[PDB]
Design a protein around this nucleic acid. Sequence first.
DNA 1: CGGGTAAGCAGTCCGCG
DNA 2: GCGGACTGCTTAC
Length: 900
Amino acid sequence: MKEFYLTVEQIGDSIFERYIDSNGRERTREVEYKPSLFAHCPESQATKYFDIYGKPCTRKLFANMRDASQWIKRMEDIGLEALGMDDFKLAYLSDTYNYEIKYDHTKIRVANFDIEVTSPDGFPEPSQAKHPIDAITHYDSIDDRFYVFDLLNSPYGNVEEWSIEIAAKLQEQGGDEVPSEIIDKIIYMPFDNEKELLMEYLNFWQQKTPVILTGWNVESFAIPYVYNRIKNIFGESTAKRLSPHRKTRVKVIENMYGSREIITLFGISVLDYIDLYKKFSFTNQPSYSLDYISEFELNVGKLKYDGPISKLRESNHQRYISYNIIAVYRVLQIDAKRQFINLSLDMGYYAKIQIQSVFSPIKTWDAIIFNSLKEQNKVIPQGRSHPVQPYPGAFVKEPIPNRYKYVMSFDLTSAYPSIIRQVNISPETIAGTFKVAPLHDYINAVAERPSDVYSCSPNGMMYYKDRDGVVPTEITKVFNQRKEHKGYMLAAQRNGEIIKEALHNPNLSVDEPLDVDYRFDFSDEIKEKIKKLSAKSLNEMLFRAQRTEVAGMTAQINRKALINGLAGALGNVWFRYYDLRNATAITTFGQMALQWIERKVNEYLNEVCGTEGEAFVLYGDTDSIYVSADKIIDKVGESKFRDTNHWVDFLDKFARERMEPAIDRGFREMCEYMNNKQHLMFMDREAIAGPPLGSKGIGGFWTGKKRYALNVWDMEGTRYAEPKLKIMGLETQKSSTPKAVQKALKECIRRMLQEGEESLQEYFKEFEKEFRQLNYISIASVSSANNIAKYDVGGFPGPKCPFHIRGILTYNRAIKGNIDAPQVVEGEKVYVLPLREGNPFGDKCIAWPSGTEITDLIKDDVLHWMDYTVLLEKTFIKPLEGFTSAAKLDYEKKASLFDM
DNA sequence: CGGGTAAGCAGTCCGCG
DNA sequence: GCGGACTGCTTAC
Ligand SMILES: Nc1ccn([C@H]2C[C@H](O)[C@@H](COP(=O)(O)OP(=O)(O)OP(=O)(O)O)O2)c(=O)n1
Ligand SMILES: [Ca+2]
Ligand SMILES: [Ca+2]
Ligand SMILES: [Ca+2]
Ligand SMILES: [Ca+2]
Ligand SMILES: [Ca+2]
Ligand SMILES: [Ca+2]
């Protein structure tokens, strides 16, 4: 097999590399890598190295990496560009792996761990590490084993060994229901004292040194706690054994409002799963506790116990250890589903970076572009300093607030990367500027043609047409990978819909789920067999279809995120290829494209309908248009349709056969107008929306920009067994809105769109009547908590104090005295509730850490004093009044003459 | 901590005769 | 009360 790196580090003048050799074995080596860097040189000097602008360069080979670094400094003191890859480990990987990396994940050691630390005096600060580590579960992907390190004797209690037999048993048997599929994979090791546990853990770690290190909050808690605890007990050199090169550094993580400390373990690639999830999941959660995320992703129930976690070890050590094991398995289960580790490995190896660099799009792209250019013997410019400057982004059309009955939407495929490809936007393809007309003149095709030579953007930039730039070339490769996974994702989705349909008629038989590849559209034979299957089999197939779809979604959406990241990296000062001319060429072209095509679709449809000046395009945002299809439906007449699916087919056919070719011609003309390199504006139909045939549903509504709801029958070629709501921006979509309120508002919208005004007033009247019975958590608002200290004036609100911060200060006073009570963590999320006047808390609201029950000390009072009236009006009535006046209907029945 | 801009709504503060 | 300036937070793209 072809070798591949596992980790790479620079330590002084050595590269330290862990790798898989040609025989599949893990090795380590130290290499005294001699970097090269580059200077411009005279024309009449024979060279094969050229900067990206075609100017000749001489290569300077250095005795060691420290000499290259010092040289870089001296070149600045002189005032001359020191060209080339200044991150020497990236050049090493480029030199050592000069081919497309074929990796084998079964050879990569992936470690998932979680620790327990009993603490009587509140939260155990990792930087202090003053309490014993009393449990470690460490899963190893190569052995496929959970190694459990269990402390039996502690200053906080002596306990009995954990029992695997009780662990296996049902919760109803007094057991812990550790899942049976992992019971045989546990290797349990009890310890008589902490020193021995840790000494064994380090010996184990040495034998099985993680390549990828993950788990939940490992970077901010587990790793620094373990590192600091071992440091305190044994000294630094023993603690540095967590690094296979014995090198670590304390790294300061700075945000807008403060900082924290993490430990960098050289020769390990730490991918904290909480950070993986935040980057790759495309959710925004009320809480990031593992219990909350586990429940959301897997639908497994909260790990439940009596009393505080601080007393769990002594009161119930058995459950304590079982929950530590289960917590590690939960992360694995989320990964089996979401496939973020897999994704990280793909992108890291593709870019030829340290795997943990996948968190940085600037670093990922710096390495992709470096490797690409290195291939042609080209030399990358030096990074330069830039002042941060604002620049313009997308156009968004102001919709007329209203109900909209029949809606068809269209949207550019990979808008910004397509613009980059079409215009040929790249650092080294800039050819000059032209005299710009106001944008409006390009939109209406009255401005002078920008160039008869170069490919243009309406921001005034021109680009070469003879050759593709390195940015379009490399962005195209990732785009193609994206398109492939999206194909599998959509197939799995359409397959899901076939299964749902079939489920309306399950057969009464005992059978097995079919062995099929869900990434591919179900053939006729598979369709036939599906119609003969039981509900049990069908459900299992649905689950598998949805897993395949989730796998496709992770792969496609984060490749989209990567390529879109490049368009934005052109506008970040830290990017080697930062250039506001290119960042703006992209965003300005986009604004033009949207408005240009709005004009064309309008002209086209007015033509088809024999009208003039009618606005068919009601809305659009960035690269999308929403076309009113009322007139199209009416021209055939609702009477001619057999059912909802009949008009949906009609519109689908109209969009594909009439609208899309009209759209394509309009864009080809725009391409010629801008003299672009390649026509790449592909605007496919997204949504077909409307009310169910013969109902009183309103089908859709807009309240404003980025605020709308649509009843959707077909999305990108997926025909739904059941209509689906596409709701954007509204309170149902916000993590700040109470869960029960999201759910109630969603149902009001479903009723408005599918059933009508009368159904809506029915549901409202009932929700208003019963809502006070809802669990307090389900009706709490959610907010991030920044700058708690800034607004804290002796425990009371300072001037301009935010409502949610006020809530926290109210909380802090109510629990003052107790180091046992959970503290709100700065920068994390809180639940917020209003309090009725003259409550014992002395203020109008209270907030507490999100994803948790509020402590028992105050819970009773909170419940008694909760202001259901305020809460109702703010979270439910206000947005609902927003929706319904927009849609021009009433949530309460107005008096009529029939009342008499 | 980690590519970008546009834009909505909640809330404070204070004006608005 | 509303609305504008401003902060804070959170979306859509
Ligand atoms: N996080 C994001 C999301 C979007 N965009 C920009 C770039 C996108 O190209 C454009 C339109 O967004 P879409 O959600 O329509 O995404 P794409 O058009 O890129 O992909 P798709 O093919 O899924 O439409 O907005 C961005 O810069 N950053
Ligand atoms: Ca725990
Ligand atoms: Ca798009
Ligand atoms: Ca599409
Ligand atoms: Ca059947
Ligand atoms: Ca879009
Ligand atoms: Ca306001």
